[PDB]
């Protein structure tokens, strides 16, 4: 699962919760645009 | 299996703790339309990089982290970087995510309050971990481990183990060139000494301080060749072990050949030096080609080792590097040689898995991973495992240029496996070897034609040695009537004991009667009757289907857990047929298909049993043949009711026979004859079962319940009437006082039940369109004797 | 909107909500048997 | 010190490395002697004069090292760096050959006579590198091409060789783009950029495009456009149709590209017309979506008449599918390809209980893959609007035909009294007028839109040989149809008045239906009364009861007194229709083009219109 | 009925289908974990 690597890239993000479960969808050949618009809609509420 | 997306998105929604809106379910539907068995997310990572950098508050950190991740060459990096880059374009989205993270962290905190690096050791740990993983995965075969002394007896691989300050310039230059000659072969010199370092890299070389600045700088410019030689010798020696797969060993052999050629070059330089007519400039010019070549090889080796990549993913990395070095002659040729060598074993395995379908997994790096499983298990267990977790695709290892045809490969091989385990495999008429090619059209075309050949031969095999057509003809003969003699004899021989309690039923006598009827008939032409058995399923249609349908509202555990043991079951309900067939012969007949078939057969058989009961009731009463028809009141009124029931059952059975059997059977038998692969016939059979189960409309609680009520009340009337007839006959308690104008009460209940059923049918049809129910109602009330009541009832609802 | 011929897709969705609805019952009843 | 040390140091500097008595002064980023290395001024002058080659070598080494530590530079950049590396290797060869003579002194004059040619070539290379920083992709070719026409035949030859070496990557990229059509560009150096944000049908105008800043120097805008078209066609060959087929010179290179483009376009058109046969798409669309074969719509109306009268809230698709399938199996249209037949369906806009079923009922044809890509939703919407108008016309003509046959049935079956004479004759007259107008309008619409535009489009496409031609022809045909369909913004009044005419037609149809209902009720009452009289006579009662006679006279008198109201309202409706059509004609009198004028003149079959309106004369 | 009825029933049916999918996933993980 690259858990250590997942944490390493999480630190690399260096932003301000995990949310890295989302990477699984990337592993399942999901469209990046679709997930981004999903995030936008989720923010909109 | 493929439902991980739903669980992940549900967890995401729960974590975000948002209830407003329609949720991600529509978004789940949108995501479902981007399915592929591989990845094709290759996009402009440069654009995402620049978009992040322009906003990156600490650019150096991001740059170093991204470069390191690239060095590891891990997948999923491109889409993740894409998402990160486009994230900051929506500042509101970023603020929302930050607020959610703060809330989650605060909630977790509240809940908690209330409630240098040696290289040898690293290599040893890596090899030990890989050995452990491969031993775990193997699980049933000997471990191909090597003796420990291979790493011992050091210096076998070839790693490293007088004043000159005032000397003349030429003399010191000659000494330095001699030392270099001895060091270019990775052997310690006298004035230049390799030194151990910290971390994974080349070895630093120290020289005497008194040596001239210019000469020492020049030899520093020279030594990268020696450093690359040291790194490549370490790579080749340490990667020679069995546990690193075949492809890595092909790479190792190529490196060995190239380094042998380099040794030839350096010894030729030595023999030229023997004449003592060489200097720094000459050797510096001479080494430049080999210098660049060894730079390339060192880069390849360090990248591969730092990525810890093994298998087809290694081929992907090598191909990516080759393309990245496009436009350079010697680099391109070297990469072509290395990739051909690496692909040789991989392409051998691919051809073996494509043409003969024989899987060979010395360490399980091939693109098809096989999971241990059995065949009788799926025939016994309802859960689907064989075609889902037997021959799966490994995504951690992927071939860069085969992704677009990855999934197809799987199917091909699996087809062969079916004809492999059957022990009837033959060499393919075409056996053209597959070879590495910079382009891709040739191999995609060849695998496509191989797939077509495999599909056609598998279909021919099914039509041949397995005769799926005959088995389907048989399974249509049984479970679906059209064996009138067989069914009538079976009923006549089984009715007497069919009413006994199940606990008193032993299927031995049931099967004895079955075989007696089979031998006492003329339907033995079928040669596949020997794969049938009689079972007593411990549940009925009504309860089984109500549990199946009425779920997730209030009945998840309300009445599903109720055990029939608390009640008594008769021999008519549990009775059913089961079919057992071998794996190679008609694998399509799955336990799921058996369940559908048995459900449909038991429903149809119960309807036939009700019809038989009504016909027997008609048979019993004949004393009124030449006696008073009008008199006898309730000994003669029942007549009308019986007529009604008969017509009713007749209607429905006709709708079940001609309006279900004919369409689905014809479409199946037609489309199957044009089926191309096994998936085609599988889909055709699934659609056949769908059509059959939808025709009877057994996919709704209310209609099933009302139909079952009608059947139960009609059966109760039949048995009560036969009780009355028996009581009258024996003369010519509850039984003696069972008549109080019983016919009137039975009709009063039945007419209301039937009108309610028709109202339900009409209401559901008005929203479900279709014409099957239209034909049902048309045949139910063809004449006007029973029309006005339905309209009057429908008027007030 | 749509093309008004979706009713077939409605039946397909019924299939997707009936077949896995059936299999889940077998999984459930197998859970209790052990 | 001795000159031997000087030559040793200068040779080291030529390699870019410092010498024993010569260093690089940071004050001028160039090599020079040091104050502790004082010697003859002439020696200093010659050493610095020679150090130019060393300085250029240092600069080129710095550039190549800096741009080689990065893997994001680019493929063309890598080839350029490799060429520079080869040039450095040749320079090293000359250094070695002069070092061979170094053994067993020399003089700076010999160094000059050996190096001045290297001096010239290194100056040319320095001028080539300093015009390349921050540049990548095809622009580098242009940068290289910046020296193609330069003089100095030796420098010209060197730069031409460098161009040929570094042009190979872009040449191979173009060759694969024209043969297989793929863009694996990582830094989007290929002039045909892409936008990974488009679907499989909108890609034709969104994803791929041109790049003016990165146009290859050798080619120009037209060459780029044609090669982009070739790439689009090749990509479409399999990315959508899933079909694949098998496929420096400069003078005929353009001709080679042109011939390849021609053959590829012809093959693409053949694939489209064979695998899909867009001609059949157009044929079926015109035959069905544009109300072609009449029997289809006639049977559809015959089946749906008993249903569409009531509000649209009670319609059902399944009946539509069944009846259209039965018509296909029964009409003369059985030859239709089942594949094309399947893709046809029925379309619903909205449920409006305030409108009859016929109003919102419509149709549509599904599109997918290449067909969807070539049929934009806007064109489909325009065709739907045209179909709406044509369906209204068909509705009115069917209404008039139905009313006329109902006349022929009922009137001939109910001609026994003089009471209905006036009403029936008036209805006959108005029906004749209505059918005349509708028939003329249908003639015009059938022999104007159905044939002319479609015929010219078919003729034009038969000789067409490009997808661009097909799309242009289809859009032009749609524009012509919509312009001649009065749907343009400049024909609002005409359409509004025509719709008013249709509304009056449907209103008078409803009125006539009401009159039919009244007549049927009166017939039923009269026959019932006669039957009751016969039963009274046959049952032993003679004469007519007082109540029976009273009811009979009351009913007949009330119906007779109500009849003149029906006559008057029919007169009023006829006057309204006459006024509406006359103002329609006066509006048309301002006709601009010729077709309208021909219709106006041909409207005079009765020749009884100009009298009411003098302007018509 | 009306066009809105079809979309409403489809939306609720799809919600039910998603719930079925999650439940069967939670059963399959229980089956595998042993």
XYZ file of N, CA and C in Angstrom, chain B residues 351-352 354-357 416 420 425-432 450 453-454 457:
60
model
N 4.777 -15.444 -24.763
C 4.392 -16.339 -25.846
C 3.882 -17.665 -25.302
N 4.524 -18.186 -24.255
C 4.047 -19.429 -23.658
C 2.636 -19.261 -23.110
N 0.445 -17.074 -24.131
C -0.483 -16.663 -25.180
C -0.861 -17.831 -26.078
N 0.125 -18.581 -26.567
C -0.153 -19.665 -27.502
C -0.560 -20.955 -26.801
N 0.197 -21.385 -25.792
C -0.125 -22.607 -25.069
C -0.893 -22.355 -23.781
N -0.949 -21.112 -23.312
C -1.681 -20.818 -22.100
C -1.075 -21.382 -20.839
N -7.271 -20.541 -22.914
C -6.415 -21.706 -23.087
C -6.403 -22.556 -21.827
N -6.645 -26.290 -21.328
C -5.431 -26.908 -20.805
C -5.762 -27.943 -19.736
N -5.200 -29.937 -25.224
C -4.549 -28.809 -25.869
C -3.786 -29.268 -27.104
N -3.718 -28.382 -28.098
C -2.984 -28.629 -29.330
C -2.159 -27.394 -29.657
N -1.064 -27.616 -30.378
C -0.220 -26.510 -30.806
C -0.981 -25.609 -31.772
N -0.821 -24.302 -31.601
C -1.516 -23.360 -32.463
C -0.990 -23.479 -33.893
N -1.855 -23.339 -34.900
C -1.355 -23.375 -36.283
C -0.330 -22.295 -36.559
N -0.475 -21.128 -35.938
C 0.504 -20.053 -36.030
C 1.312 -20.042 -34.741
N 2.636 -20.021 -34.873
C 3.540 -20.030 -33.731
C 4.595 -18.947 -33.889
N 4.249 -17.872 -34.593
C 5.191 -16.783 -34.815
C 5.642 -16.211 -33.478
N -4.272 -13.749 -32.283
C -4.176 -14.884 -31.372
C -5.425 -14.994 -30.509
N -8.196 -16.437 -32.654
C -8.003 -17.873 -32.822
C -8.388 -18.629 -31.557
N -7.955 -18.132 -30.397
C -8.272 -18.796 -29.139
C -9.774 -18.834 -28.906
N -11.416 -21.380 -31.331
C -11.123 -22.770 -31.000
C -11.837 -23.173 -29.717
